[PDB]
Each structure stands twice: as C-alpha cells, then as structure tokens.
C-alpha cells in the first residue's frame, strides 16, 4: 500500500528495497541516487541505535577511568579532548577502510556494491535468505525508530537536565 493515499506512488520507489511503503512526499528519490539515500539512512539509523544504547548505558554505568556527569549528554563534556579526537579519528579510519577509500557519491557505488552492505557479518547470521530479508526489514524499521528515539532522548535530556530512566520516574512538567 501507499503511506500517502492522496498522492501517487513515487516512481523511483519500486518496493524492492526493504521498508518501502511508498513514503517520499517531498520526492527526494527524484533528485538523488537511491543507493546513496539507502547508505545514508542505514548509517544514520545504525549510529542512532548505538546512540540510544549508549544513552541508556552511560546513565547507569561509568568506567572508573572517566568521571560521570549528571546526564549522559554532559558525559561528552567531561571526557578529555584527546580521547574524543581518538574516537573521531578511529571512526574516520573505519569510514575510510569500510568504503574502500571511496567516500563520495560519484565513486561509492562505482563497483556495483550494495547500499548498507559493508561486508561486516562476523557471526554467521547471513546464510538464510528468507531470514536475511526479514532482518533487513527489522534493521531499517529499528533504525528509523532509533533515529526518532535518539532525537527524543537527547532533546529531553538536554531540556530536563536528567537522564532518560531518571525522567521516567519522578516525572515533572513544564510550568
């Protein structure tokens, strides 16, 4: 079916990709390559899944090497700067090596590579095709859900100044 019944189905969304319900009202797929859009969507969603898990874990668990802030967003501002640069450059090395040093929309998919498939499947998990399709669908939906969830958790922790589970209990309202 179509997500928006009062508009026609976007012609570049053919339903082959997992998660396609026909939702492109602005028409982003009419201008940009769909492989770049899928790589960006999966990367944003994966970063948000790790961010949701980190925001839930850094509220309660703090390694003794670091010194926890009152909220997981303030936890960024108490880390040494060299450590943040270390994480940033390690992520840059991963981004360089996982893409074959091909980091731009003009050469990322020049060798016919699949969007979001960087060949990282260590623990088996990828032999059944019928399970591969369903796990693709689960990955894209949980990625979008973790995008919206991470946006909510970060903005409400910035607003209230307390953590997420610290806000689920003793819940206050704007007054």
């Amino acid at each position: 079916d179509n997500a928006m019944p009062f508009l026609e189905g976007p012609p570049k969304l053919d339903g082959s990709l997992a998660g396609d319900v026909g939702f492109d009202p602005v028409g982003f797929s009419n201008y940009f390559d769909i492989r770049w859009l899928r790589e960006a969507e999966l990367k944003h969603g994966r970063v948000c899944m790790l961010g949701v898990t980190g925001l839930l874990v850094q509220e309660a668990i703090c390694l003794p090497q670091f010194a926890n802030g009152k909220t997981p967003v303030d936890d960024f501002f108490v880390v040494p700067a060299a450590g943040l640069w270390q994480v940033f450059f390690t992520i840059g090395a991963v981004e360089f090596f996982s893409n074959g040093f091909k980091l731009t929309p003009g050469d990322m998919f020049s060798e016919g590579r699949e969007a979001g498939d960087l060949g990282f499947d260590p623990l088996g998990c990828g032999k059944n095709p019928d399970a591969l399709a369903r796990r693709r669908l689960v990955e894209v939906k949980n990625g979008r859900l973790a995008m919206i969830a991470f946006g909510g958790m970060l903005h409400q922790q910035l607003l209230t100044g307390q953590g997420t589970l610290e806000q689920l209990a003793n819940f206050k309202a704007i007054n």
């Binding site: 700067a81 060299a82 910035l158 209230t160």
Partner: protein, 154 residues
C-alpha cells in the same frame, strides 16, 4: 532605417548575437519565464518551489526560537543563548559558531517568533482618522470636506 530607441543592435551597427531562443510558456511559482535547459521545469517547477518554501517555513519555527532552554527547580524554563555553549576539544576556541550565528535575532534586538512577528516586535497599527468624522466636526478635526464647506459658507 534606424528608429530611435528601437533596441535592435543591427539597426545601431552594434555587434549582434544571432542566436535568439524561443520563449516557452512554462511558469514557475517563485521563478521567471524564460529559456531553460531540458529537464529544468520538471525538476524545479512550481511543485519543487512550493515544497521547499513549505519546508523552509517549517524549519524556520525551531530556528526562530533558538536557544538552550533549561528547566529550573520550580518547573519554569530559562532560555539562554547558544553563544555560551562551550565545547571541550577545539583548543582555545571554547565559544564556537552556532545556529544563532547564522540567525542573530538578539544581536539586532529583534524579538523573533515562529511567524517572525514577536511580542516585542509586533506590527504597529494605528488609526489615522483620529476618532473623528468625515464632515461636521467641532474640535481638533478639520477635514477637507469641512474646508470646502467653510469655503462655500463665508
């Protein structure tokens, strides 16, 4: 042979162009009629322009009310500028450019709102008729009709 202000360069001995494109009838909402590349009015016609204007007006609403809103003990909110947002890891540049750098409403004393007229930036409307009438006024109201009437009645 050469009419004044004719605007034909060959009539004035001016270097001509030769190539004159035909004028298409396709129209864009915020653009102009004229010769364009093939594919141009189909990607960037009225639909695209209206969609981008809608998206810009939508995104204006968080941008106009830009700031760090912090809850206090009584549940009230204190809004403070992004200019005090400090970063740990760019050396001696603790203060950094933010979204309020691109949209500095408070620098000009402009009370921005999500529809861009604020409480302290309201459009000022005042009635110029001063609470009197068109004719037969006795007071601080001498209209043009009263001047005409006094000119006849003298």
């Amino acid at each position: 042979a050469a009419v004044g202000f004719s605007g034909v360069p060959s009539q004035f001995g001016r270097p001509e162009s030769g190539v004159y494109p035909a004028e298409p009838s396709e129209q864009t909402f915020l653009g102009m009629r004229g010769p364009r590349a093939p594919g141009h009015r189909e990607n960037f016609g009225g639909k695209h322009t209206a969609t981008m204007l809608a998206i810009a007006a939508l995104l204006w609403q968080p941008v106009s009310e830009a700031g760090m809103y912090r809850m206090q003990g009584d549940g009230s909110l204190t809004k403070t500028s992004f200019n005090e947002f400090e970063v740990p890891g760019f050396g001696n540049a603790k203060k950094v450019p933010t979204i309020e750098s691109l949209f500095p409403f408070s620098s000009k004393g402009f009370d921005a709102s999500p529809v861009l007229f604020g409480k302290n930036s309201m459009i000022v409307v005042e009635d110029p008729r001063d609470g009197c009438g068109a004719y037969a006024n006795s007071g601080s109201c001498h209209t043009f009709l009263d001047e005409i009437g006094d000119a006849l009645k003298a």
